[PDB]
Ligand binder design. Structure first.
Ligand SMILES: Cc1cc2nc3c(=O)[nH]c(=O)nc-3n(C[C@H](O)[C@H](O)[C@H](O)COP(=O)(O)O)c2cc1C
Length: 138
């Protein structure tokens, strides 16, 4: 499996590691990839796309790297299963509600409720691990 993410201070990156740990604990292999080093072709061969990005300016996906990546794969992911996650600060998850609506709009099947955690996943560590375990069972 593969987890692709963008993180500006390390919050979403930490979530990604924790989600990977859950998948591994369930007996499966998984690689975490920063959006900068992702290979679209190899990524498109995955049965489930696990994508994460923190909330950026005015509740949007990160603009210089993550958004363009989503746009590029947008026409080639109809029917694919996706699990979404990310860290946020002062908002209430608007960027994620929009990210979920967008992926659905591209024809994807959002398999679980998106996992969102405020700032660093300190108290929410187990929640991240459990999300990974749910994904491993799909
Ligand atoms: C430029 C900028 C804009 C932000 N905009 C939002 C926002 O609109 N809503 C929100 O809840 N958090 C916002 N945040 C806070 C981040 O989503 C939050 O700090 C998160 O934990 C960052 O995770 P990361 O280290 O994975 O990037 C913003 C942060 C930055 C740096």
């Amino acid at each position: 499996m593969k987890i692709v993410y963008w993180s500006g201070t390390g919050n979403t990156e930490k979530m990604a590691e924790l989600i990977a740990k859950g998948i591994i604990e369930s007996g499966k292999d998984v690689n975490t990839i920063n959006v900068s080093d992702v290979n679209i072709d190899e990524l498109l061969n995955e049965d489930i796309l696990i994508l994460g990005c923190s909330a950026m300016t005015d509740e949007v996906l990160e603009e210089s790297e993550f958004e363009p990546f989503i746009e590029e794969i947008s026409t080639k992911i109809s029917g694919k299963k996706v699990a979404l996650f990310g860290s946020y600060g002062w908002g209430d998850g608007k960027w994620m509600r929009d990210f979920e609506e967008r992926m659905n709009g591209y024809g994807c099947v959002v398999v679980e409720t998106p996992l969102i955690v405020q700032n660093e996943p300190d108290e929410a560590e187990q929640d991240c691990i459990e999300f990974g375990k749910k994904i491993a069972n799909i």
